[PDB]
Amino acid sequence: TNLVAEPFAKLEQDFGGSIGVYAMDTGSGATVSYRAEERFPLCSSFKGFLAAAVLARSQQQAGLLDTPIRYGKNALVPWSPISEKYLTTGMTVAELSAAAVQYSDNAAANLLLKELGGPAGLTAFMRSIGDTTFRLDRWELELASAIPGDARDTSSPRAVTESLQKLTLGSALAAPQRQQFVDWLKGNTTGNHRIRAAVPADWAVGDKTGTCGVYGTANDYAVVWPTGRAPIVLAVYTRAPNKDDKHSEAVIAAAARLALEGLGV
């Protein structure tokens, strides 16, 4: 954590914003922590926890995941790359969950939020697994304003990492649901230039990205399975002071590398 404190401070000076990282080695329990308790906008990264919340309630409602959902043109928000293709047919809850995780589909996300009782419902789920930091307040795309100092629709890298470990590796989800959750994340298509880019080919990895765009705000959280040791869980979030500041996928990848090197690769 101190082996990387000055490399991190330099990386974020080159970026021109702020970088929050929390990484945990599930074996030794070693952690690496940089701005890990600061709040960062979640952007689309709430969609992973959305799917986990849906999986949780499929433990009470049999057939939830295969329930068909029908929706109108008015449900199609900018960047709905999957749900726009099934507008005239509809989609199952599992297909919408997969779309939200693997393509960061915004209409799918908002449809799933409705089923859960909106942002308060998802926040309620996160409280039930012991996360007191997470808050979702708004819908796509309003949630992505990324205003400096605004606590709405934020969490911390450490809370994100801790909740992810509970849902992917711990006991927050029953074992069928937990494996489904992990599979959706492993099939994510939007994270090739972020945490995955810090990861060698022979490692298994599931992630979920977030890209507010404004205020140089983007993120990525991931469970990483090295060959021959325990999985690593980590979260990398960024933000920047000016609305037109650009986010950097390379900066996220670079913080992921520093976190893995900090834990002992």
Ligand SMILES: C[C@@H](O)[C@@H](C(=O)O)[C@H]1CC(SCCNC=N)=C(C(=O)O)N1
């Ligand atoms: C446009 C907005 O919904 C954005 C967000 O709020 O985060 C969506 C769209 C997308 S852009 C995905 C582009 N990926 C390219 N490889 C992100 C993301 O990065 O996860 N989520």
